[PDB]
Design a protein around this ligand. Structure first.
Ligand SMILES: O=N[O-]
Ligand SMILES: O=N[O-]
Ligand SMILES: [Cu+2]
Ligand SMILES: [Cu+2]
Ligand SMILES: [Cu+2]
Ligand SMILES: [Cu+2]
Ligand SMILES: [Cu+2]
Ligand SMILES: [Cu+2]
Lengths: 423, 423
């Protein structure tokens, strides 16, 4: 699995004994905590030396163990598949340490992990939720309605956050016009909003890319008209101060201005944006997460997310496609601050629309592409065969802050393209 | 023995192991220190819990152990006689703790502990260094010469201190006159003094008990005349500010004004004074000790002393007498701050001159007497048999800050007054 169940253990002194102490998630501050796992899960255990004696962690029945950590903060992580149901001791093998109290239980339970019942609104955009290619047709006036809505969202399994959105979801609505079109934009600020909201389009020409015309009080509406003069895949975002605050809380989307010829024919299109959230408490903490200004202005986030939430593109709203289909991903970074190294594990991009230019020829046979904040790109590839394909920022420490997505494709395990054993 | 060899161990994590860490003395900060002891010595080990797991210390061959100490700072002291030469493990008996590093050696060496060659002047006043009884004699004019002297002294085995003294010793000269006498006092302050010095006698009547006429610059001399109008046993001390500072540094002594008859004849007299020293580093620290002003004004000393130094009346200048003698101790407290609960282990005070009154009838058959700072008394008793008799302040935590003394008396171990076995 590419979504492991993760436990962190710090060694220390508690309850009169030398013990393991849980760090974060369901086990924060618990001594020799029970590590509860469902049959077939991939288990990652992070050991961190707390007090400065020599430690490891060993699970006999799984032939699994950490390395020995000597100094304070010295760390070793290990993994295994929970293939066996029952109760297994994790313990320190250093002389005396097990007898001194370094022992807990790993419990492996039969059947799959139930999903935790949510407490707040689902604020993740389905990656399939976008309008398809516009016909060939004459340029014309297109009317777009945007509503700025502040609302609590399910950030993780048992953690919530106050999101600011376009139309109650992150990213906002996928906007699709033809070059030459005239856009008639209506921005309504919901009555229950505390804050002024706005929108800047990177595909609009003029002051604030429309921000100067769209500063909207709560319970008010603004209206602006603008010509789509350039074809491109453009990010749009709120542009009321603090702009970085409005962006991190979720006020970003994509505007595709199609060129006259349209993009190349493709079997299936998806919508994905990457952002950061700057919380007071670390990734994994349950309850109401709140915003940490000091972390926002110093570019030190706790959450890296696709489409608004942890599990957004794995559990709640993953991507589905069929073997033999050509797939297009419109991929944008709201940010506000981090450049994404976008990669699909198990795939190679046939075409990459460099800097999101839709008029310059796309680059060919590319593994991984840099997308800046306030930037976007288009990748396409042919699905030759089945598998779970994984969307990642190849700054791979971001796996441990929520940044992972699934493209699920039904097919055999073994074919001519990739198989176990030799020819 | 009333001079046990003392070691303090704190449990902790050091050199990547769970260990014992030496606290002060020759073992400060050493991990699992070697405890070096001489054959026949009484050993005291204080175990203090550092990090908060359960611990003890055990030495198999001496059937000795601490109690189990559980939380941080929890302590257990134990003792035994080092009767067998060789090497012996002290260890923690809690499950795994020995294996995990909680083990050191006690080395019992043959022969007697050698004394450290001293590095500074001996500032200790011998308890026999006082003038004998004044004959019957008419009242008259007596000239007394005092010199105020600043000098480093041997405070302990391997520790020094800047003492301020009358005539280079602590306490100062025992002054002996008859009531009605006229005292011609000369006070020479040494050239090499940083500070002004002076003297207030409690047996003198008028401004500052002479202090107003004795404020003496370095290299200068004051002369003052005063009448000894009252019989008593009077403490005298420097009266130059800070007076507490001048007293702690050594500037106290005793003035006996004999009544017309003189005091009842006794076979042998002794001179003893108690005081405190207020150092930055705790009791037992080697090196030059320095004064801590915050500890002096808050009355939190590190040394409690008889006649100026640790070992003053045990090692360097102890008391000596013979069976059948009547003994008198002039005992005063310089202080500056603490009241002494004066007592001689193995003896009872035949007479106590309550509040140092020499004219009121003495109290009889008294175990222990309170002497305030700036007060003295007289005690006498008959030595009915032999032994080492021990001078103490019976606030007995002051044993561990250097306050103990020996009266050595040659006689058999067993006799009619106290013996092994039944009658
Ligand atoms: O394929 N790398 O995540
Ligand atoms: O017997 N007194 O310590
Ligand atoms: Cu361990
Ligand atoms: Cu906004
Ligand atoms: Cu922008
Ligand atoms: Cu122990
Ligand atoms: Cu003085
Ligand atoms: Cu006084």
């Amino acid at each position: 699995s590419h979504a492991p169940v993760v436990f962190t253990l710090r060694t220390g002194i508690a309850e009169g004994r030398m013990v393991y102490i849980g760090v974060g998630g369901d086990i924060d501050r618990q001594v020799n905590p029970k590590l509860v796992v469902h049959e077939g899960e991939t288990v990652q255990i992070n050991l961190i030396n707390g007090e400065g004696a020599q430690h490891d962690a060993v699970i006999d029945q799984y032939a699994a163990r950490s390395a020995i950590v000597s100094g304070k903060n010295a760390s070793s992580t290990f993994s295994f598949i929970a293939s066996k149901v029952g109760q297994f001791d994790y313990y320190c093998s250093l002389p005396g340490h097990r007898q001194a109290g370094m022992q807990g239980v790993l419990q492996v339970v039969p059947g799959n992990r139930a999903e935790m019942p949510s407490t707040a609104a689902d604020i993740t955009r389905d990656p399939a939720d976008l309008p398809g290619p516009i016909g060939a047709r004459q340029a014309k006036t297109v009317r777009i309605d945007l509503e700025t809505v502040e609302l609590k969202g399910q950030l993780d399994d048992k953690t919530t956050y106050t999101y600011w959105t376009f139309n109650g979801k992150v990213p906002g609505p996928f906007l699709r016009v033809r070059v030459g079109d005239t856009v008639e934009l209506h921005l309504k600020n919901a009555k229950d909003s505390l804050m002024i909201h706005s929108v800047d389009f990177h595909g609009a020409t003029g002051p604030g890319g429309a921000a100067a015309y769209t500063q909207t009080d709560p319970g008010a509406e603004t209206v602006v008209t603008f010509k789509a003069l350039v074809p491109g895949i453009f990010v749009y975002h709120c542009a009321t101060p603090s702009v970085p605050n409005h962006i991190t809380n979720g006020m970003y989307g994509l505007l595709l201005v199609e060129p006259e010829g349209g993009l190349p024919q493709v079997d299936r299109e998806f919508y994905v944006m990457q952002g950061e959230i700057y919380t007071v408490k670390p990734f994994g903490t349950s309850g109401e997460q709140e915003m940490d200004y000091e972390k926002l202005i110093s570019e030190k986030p706790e959450y890296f997310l696709f489409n608004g939430s942890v599990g957004a593109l794995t559990r709640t709203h993953p991507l589905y496609a069929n073997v033999g289909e050509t797939v297009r991903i419109f991929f944008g970074v709201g940010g506000p601050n981090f450049t994404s190294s976008f990669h699909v594990i198990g795939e190679i991009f046939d075409h990459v629309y460099a800097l999101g230019s839709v008029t310059s020829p796309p680059l060919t046979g590319v593994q991984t592409v840099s997308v800046p904040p306030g930037g976007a790109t288009i990748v396409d590839f042919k699905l030759d065969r089945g598998g779970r394909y994984v969307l990642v920022d190849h700054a791979l420490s971001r796996l441990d802050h929520g940044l992972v997505g699934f493209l699920n494709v039904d097919g055999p395990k073994n074919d001519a393209i990739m198989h176990e054993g030799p020819p």
